[PDB]
């Protein structure tokens, strides 16, 4: 991380609040003097060594990535106090709760173009070692031009040697089996949470039972006119055997042919008639 000279940042607003702090947006004017909009998340004061180290050491991470759909750190400032962490600002805010503000107002190609961010922003995470672990609408973010950026590396981890339910593949909740195939099933839950409009995976179930109802094959059911194709793409990457999922790589690919055939989403899945708000895959 770059350490950054405070004469350089303005803070304009708090916009929102974390678990170590707030977070403002403002401006920071580069080396080259122009000035660009920024996120600016501040430690609070009479933090611990622990909350230190964590705060840091998730920007840390940040900084090993430079990707157009993985959120930029700008840098860091550590010489003085209050602590910072400054990152490209992203003006929609999470992708979830922006969603949840336009339900039905958006077009497939635009919910697809949102997917195809995300995807590619987990190949590049993915190619680098990481696995995500809390991959989910929720932790990514997306800016004045719809643009999603994968954010939140709180419990990320290089692969080497609370953590949500909703998100998590069969076989990590089982036994802590964390891969980037696990990340694909993650994945799959966003895709149903951006065709849902940031509906909450699997409700107000039963963490007992979305881990019970998942293991015993059953599966979110296709969102309101959801495209065939990415139905059949979530129930892909939702795969019980880890190794029958898409790699990310493949998923950008078959999210490209959808953008460039944009007809092809035209053919729609429904379950109407099914017996249960969960739907078995049979496959
Ligand atoms: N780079 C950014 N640009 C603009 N707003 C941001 C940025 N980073 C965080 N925020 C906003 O700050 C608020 C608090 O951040 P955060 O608590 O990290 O988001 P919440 O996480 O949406 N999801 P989660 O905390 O995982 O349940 C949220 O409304 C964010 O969208
Ligand atoms: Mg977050």
């Known amino acids: ?54 705060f840091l050491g998730e920007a840390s991470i940040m900084g090993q990535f430079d990707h157009p ?22 003006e929609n805010g999470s992708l979830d709760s922006f969603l ?16 195809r961010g995300i995807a590619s922003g987990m190949k590049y995470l993915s190619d680098m070692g990481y696995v995500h672990r809390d991959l989910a609408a929720r932790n990514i973010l997306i800016n004045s031009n719809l643009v999603c950026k994968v954010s939140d590396f709180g419990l990320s981890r290089v ?10 593949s069969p076989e990590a909740i089982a036994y802590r089996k964390f891969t980037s195939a696990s990340d694909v099933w993650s994945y799959g839950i966003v ?45 892909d990457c939702w795969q019980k055997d880890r190794n029958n999922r898409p790699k990310f790589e493949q998923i950008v690919s078959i999210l490209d042919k959808l953008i460039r055939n944009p007809g092809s989403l035209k053919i729609i899945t429904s379950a109407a008639a099914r017996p249960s708000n969960l739907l078995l895959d049979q496959s």
Not at 100 to 115: E, P, S, Y
């Open 191 to 235: 895709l149903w949470e951006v065709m849902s409009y940031g509906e909450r995976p699997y409700w107000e179930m039963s963490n007992q039972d979305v881990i019970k109802a998942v293991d015993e094959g059953y599966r979110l059911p296709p969102p309101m006119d959801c495209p065939a194709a990415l139905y059949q793409l979530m129930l």
């Open 159 to 168: 692969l080497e040697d609370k953590i949500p339910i909703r998100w998590t």
């Open 69 to 90: 759909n993985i959120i930029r750190l700008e840098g860091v400032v550590t010489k003085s106090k209050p602590v910072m962490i400054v990152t490209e600002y992203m």
């Open 100 to 115: 949840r503000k336009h339900d039905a107002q958006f077009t497939v190609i635009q919910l697809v173009g949102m997917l």
């Open 1 to 54: 991380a770059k350490e950054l000279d405070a004469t350089n940042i303005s803070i304009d607003k708090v916009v929102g609040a974390g678990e170590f702090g707030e977070v403002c947006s403002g401006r920071l004017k580069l080396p080259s003097k122009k000035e660009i909009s920024v996120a600016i998340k501040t430690l609070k004061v009479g933090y611990t060594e622990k909350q230190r180290r964590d």
